[PDB]
Design a protein around this ligand. Structure first.
Ligand SMILES: C[C@H](CCC(=O)NCCC[N+](C)(C)C[C@H](O)CS(=O)(=O)O)[C@H]1CC[C@H]2[C@@H]3[C@H](O)C[C@@H]4C[C@H](O)CC[C@]4(C)[C@H]3C[C@H](O)[C@]12C
Ligand SMILES: C[C@H](CCC(=O)NCCC[N+](C)(C)C[C@H](O)CS(=O)(=O)O)[C@H]1CC[C@H]2[C@@H]3[C@H](O)C[C@@H]4C[C@H](O)CC[C@]4(C)[C@H]3C[C@H](O)[C@]12C
Lengths: 50, 556
C-alpha cells in the first residue's frame, strides 16, 4: 500500500531484455524487402475486424 | 501546480476521494505513521470519508458536504504546509530525539576536564566567601552552638581537609587569630585577614551550611545593591542628575559624600531641591556606610567578590550543563526497560534526567572510575522511585510495592515448579509472613478498572450506566418521616405546657441543638432532679395506650 510505480521495471528488474519481452508478449509478423518491393506473409484469420 | 491541486478539485468535483489517492498523492516527507490524520480531517470538512475501497450508493453526501463550513482556511493551511516540507514532527518523541541528537558524546578526558572546572568553580567561590569579616562571626556562633551543646557535632562539619579534638583546637586558634586581627585593624590588618582566610581554607562545611552562608552573604549583598540602586534611582530621576556627571563624580565610591556635596555645590536648581529629600537620600548613604562598616574593607572588593562568585557559579553551571547533555543519551538508554509500567515514556526519561543531574553534582572523578557507571545507579534509582510512586491510582508505599513484586516472583516460581498453581497457604510457606497478610496484599494489587469500559455490546451502553447510588434515601422514607413529625407534633400538643417544653428541649424536636438537664433547668431557672423526674413522668404516662396506639402502630 505504497506509492504507485510503473511496472515494466519489475518485469525488467529480473534482468530481462526488451527484445525478449516483446518476444514473450507479442507474436511477430516478418516482412521481407526485395526487388525494392514489400510483401507480407498473410494469415487471413488475423485480418478479422479490419 | 503540485500533487494536491489535482486532488482538492476531485474531492468536490467527483464527490469523494478514495484512500488510494490521498496515499500516493502525498509528497515524500511527512508520511510519518498517521501524519495524514490532519489532511484527512481537512478533506473531511469538504465531504469525503470514503469507505474501504470506494463504494457508492447513497444520495446523502451533500448534507454532510453542507455540514462542513465555508471558512476554508484549511485549504491555505494544507497548501502552505505541504508546499514547504518542514517536517511536521508533532510527536514530542521525535523533536526531543533531535534535540539530544545535537550534543555529541563528551568522551572520557573531556569529562575529567569538566570535572576539574566544576571543582575549580566550587573552590573559587569558597575562597571568595572567606573574604569579609561577617562570615566567620556566624561560623563561630554555630560552632559554639554545637560545642556549648546547643546544637550537634554532625550538624556543622562532615570531616575537614588536612577528629573533634582537632576541630576544637583549630577553632580555638581561629578565635585567637580573628580577635587579634580585628584589634590590629588599624595595610597590616589586610595581610592578617588574608592569613586568617588562608587558615580558614581548611574548613569543609555541611552542604546545608554552605548554602546558608552563600544565602546570608547574598541577602546582605541584596541589601547593599537595593539600597544603592534606590539611592541612585531617587537621585537621577527626582534630582534630574545628568548621567555622565553621575558616572564621573558618583562612580568609584558610592559611599562618601564628596559627590553629594559637589553636586549640591554645582548650583543647579535641582541641586537646591536636593535638600527636599536630602534626609532620605543621605540616610540611605549612611545606612550603606554602616553596612560597609560591618564589611569594613572598602566598596570595590564587594564588587570583586560578587563578580567572582558569579563567574565561579557560571563556570560550574556550564560544566554541569555539558555533562548532563552528554549523558542524556545514557539516561534514555536506561529508560527503555521500564516503559511498560503504565507510565509514559517521556515522564521516565525526565525522571532519569533528574537522577543524572543529581549524579553529576555528586560525582567524584578522583576515585578513578568512569562516570557512566556511577550515574547509572542514580538514574535507575530515580526511575524506579518515580515509576513506583506515580504509577497506581491509589498510590501505594514503595515497600508494599516491593513486597507485591516479590510475591509475584515467588508465585510464578512455585507455579512452574509445582504444575497446578500455588494456594495462598503455599505462598505463605515460601514467605515468612503470617499468611494472614498475604491475602491482604493480594487484595491491594487490584488496579481500578476503567468506568468507560464498553459492556457486552448492546451498543451505546457503557459500564457507568449501571452503578447505582445507595446514598439516596427512598421517597417512601421521606413520607414516613413527614408522618412521624406530624404524629409527634399532635401527641406533644396533647401534653401539658411544661411537659411539652421538657420533652422538646431535652431532644431537638422543632429546635436546634438539644439542651441537657442543667441548661434546660437554667432556662426554667429550676435546675435539679425535678426536671428529669418530669421527663420520666411524661414518658411513663405516655406509655399508656390510646396515646401510644398511633405510635405503637407507627413502630417499624
Ligand atoms: C472487559 C469485560 C467485557 C466483557 C464483554 O464484553 N463480554 C461480551 C459477552 C458477549 N456474549 C458472550 C455474552 C455473547 C452476546 O450476548 C451475544 S453476541 O456474541 O455479541 O452476538 C468486563 C465487562 C463486565 C466486567 C466484570 C464486572 O466488572 C464484574 C467483575 C469485577 C471484577 O473486579 C473483575 C471481574 C469482573 C467479572 C469484570 C470483568 C471485566 O472487567 C468485565 C467482564
Ligand atoms: C458483563 C455482564 C454482561 C452479561 C451478558 O451479556 N449475558 C448474556 C447472556 C446470554 N444468554 C446466556 C442469556 C443467552 C441469550 O439467549 C443470548 S442473547 O442475549 O439473546 O443474544 C453484565 C450484565 C449484569 C451486569 C452486572 C450487574 O449490573 C450487577 C453489578 C453492578 C455493578 O455496578 C457492576 C458489576 C455488576 C456485577 C454488573 C456488571 C456487568 O455490567 C454485568 C455482569
Amino acid at each position: 500500500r505504497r506509492r504507485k510505480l510503473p511496472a515494466t521495471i519489475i518485469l525488467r528488474a529480473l534482468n530481462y531484455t526488451t527484445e525478449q519481452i516483446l518476444d514473450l508478449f507479442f507474436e511477430k509478423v516478418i516482412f521481407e524487402i526485395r526487388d525494392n518491393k514489400l510483401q507480407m506473409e498473410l494469415v487471413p484469420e488475423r485480418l478479422r475486424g479490419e | 501546480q503540485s500533487q494536491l491541486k489535482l486532488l482538492v478539485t476531485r474531492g468536490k468535483e467527483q464527490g469523494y476521494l478514495t484512500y488510494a489517492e490521498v496515499n500516493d498523492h502525498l509528497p515524500e516527507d511527512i508520511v510519518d505513521s498517521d501524519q495524514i490524520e490532519d489532511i484527512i480531517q481537512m478533506i473531511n470538512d469538504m465531504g469525503i470519508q470514503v469507505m474501504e475501497e470506494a463504494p457508492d450508493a447513497d444520495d446523502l453526501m451533500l448534507a454532510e458536504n453542507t455540514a462542513d463550513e465555508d471558512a476554508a482556511e484549511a485549504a491555505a493551511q494544507v497548501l502552505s504546509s505541504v508546499e514547504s516540507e518542514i517536517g511536521r514532527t508533532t510527536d514530542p518523541v521525535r523533536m526531543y530525539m533531535r534535540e539530544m541528537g545535537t550534543v555529541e558524546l563528551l568522551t572520557r578526558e573531556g569529562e575529567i576536564d569538566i570535572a576539574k572546572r566544576i571543582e575549580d568553580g566550587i573552590n573559587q567561590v569558597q575562597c571568595s566567601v572567606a573574604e569579609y569579616p561577617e562570615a566567620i562571626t556566624y561560623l563561630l556562633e554555630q560552632y559554639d552552638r554545637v560545642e556549648a551543646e546547643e546544637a550537634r557535632l554532625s550538624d556543622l562539619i562532615t570531616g575537614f581537609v588536612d577528629d573533634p579534638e582537632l576541630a576544637r583546637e583549630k577553632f580555638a586558634e581561629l578565635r585567637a587569630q580573628y580577635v587579634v586581627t580585628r584589634d590590629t585593624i588599624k595595610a597590616t590588618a589586610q595581610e592578617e585577614i588574608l592569613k586568617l582566610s588562608e587558615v580558614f581554607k581548611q574548613f569543609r562545611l555541611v552542604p546545608k551550611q554552605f548554602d546558608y552562608l552563600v544565602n546570608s552573604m547574598r541577602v546582605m549583598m541584596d541589601r547593599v545593591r537595593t539600597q544603592e540602586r534606590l539611592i541612585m534611582k531617587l537621585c537621577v530621576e527626582q534630582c534630574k542628575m545628568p548621567k555622565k556627571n553621575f558616572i564621573t563624580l558618583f562612580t568609584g565610591n558610592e559611599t562618601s559624600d564628596t559627590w553629594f556635596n559637589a553636586a549640591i555645590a554645582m548650583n543647579k536648581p535641582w541641586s537646591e531641591k536636593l535638600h527636599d529629600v536630602s534626609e532620605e537620600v543621605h540616610r540611605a548613604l549612611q545606612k550603606l556606610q554602616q553596612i560597609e562598616e560591618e564589611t569594613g574593607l572598602t566598596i570595590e572588593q564587594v564588587k570583586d567578590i560578587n563578580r567572582r562568585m558569579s563567574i565561579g557559579e557560571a563556570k560550574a553551571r556550564r560544566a554541569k550543563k555539558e555533562m548532563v547533555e552528554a549523558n542524556l543519551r545514557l539516561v534514555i538508554s536506561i529508560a527503555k526497560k521500564y516503559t511498560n509500567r503504565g507510565l509514559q515514556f517521556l515522564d521516565l526519561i525526565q525522571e532519569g534526567n533528574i537522577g543524572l543531574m543529581k549524579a553529576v553534582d555528586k560525582f567524584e572523578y578522583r576515585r578513578g572510575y568512569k562516570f557512566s557507571t556511577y550515574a547509572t545507579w542514580w538514574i535507575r534509582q530515580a526511575i524506579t522511585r518515580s515509576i513506583a510512586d506515580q504509577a497506581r491510582t491509589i498510590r501505594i508505599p514503595v515497600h508494599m510495592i516491593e513486597t507485591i513484586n516479590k510475591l509475584n516472583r515467588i508465585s510464578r516460581q512455585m507455579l512452574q515448579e509445582m504444575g497446578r498453581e500455588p494456594t495462598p497457604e503455599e505462598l505463605a510457606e515460601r514467605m515468612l509472613m503470617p499468611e494472614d497478610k498475604i491475602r491482604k496484599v493480594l487484595k491491594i494489587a487490584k488496579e481500578p478498572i476503567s468506568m468507560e469500559t464498553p459492556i457486552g455490546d448492546d451498543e451505546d451502553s457503557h459500564l457507568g450506566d449501571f452503578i447505582e447510588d445507595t446514598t439516596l434515601e427512598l421517597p417512601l422514607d421521606s413520607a414516613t418521616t413527614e408522618s412521624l413529625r406530624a404524629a409527634t407534633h399532635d401527641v406533644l400538643a396533647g401534653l401539658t405546657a411544661r411537659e411539652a417544653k421538657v420533652l422538646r428541649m431535652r431532644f431537638g424536636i422543632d429546635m436546634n441543638t438539644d439542651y441537657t438537664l442543667e441548661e434546660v433547668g437554667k432556662q426554667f431557672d429550676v435546675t435539679r432532679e425535678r426536671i428529669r423526674q418530669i421527663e420520666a413522668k411524661a414518658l411513663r404516662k405516655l406509655r399508656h395506650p390510646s396515646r401510644s396506639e398511633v405510635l405503637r402502630s407507627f413502630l417499624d
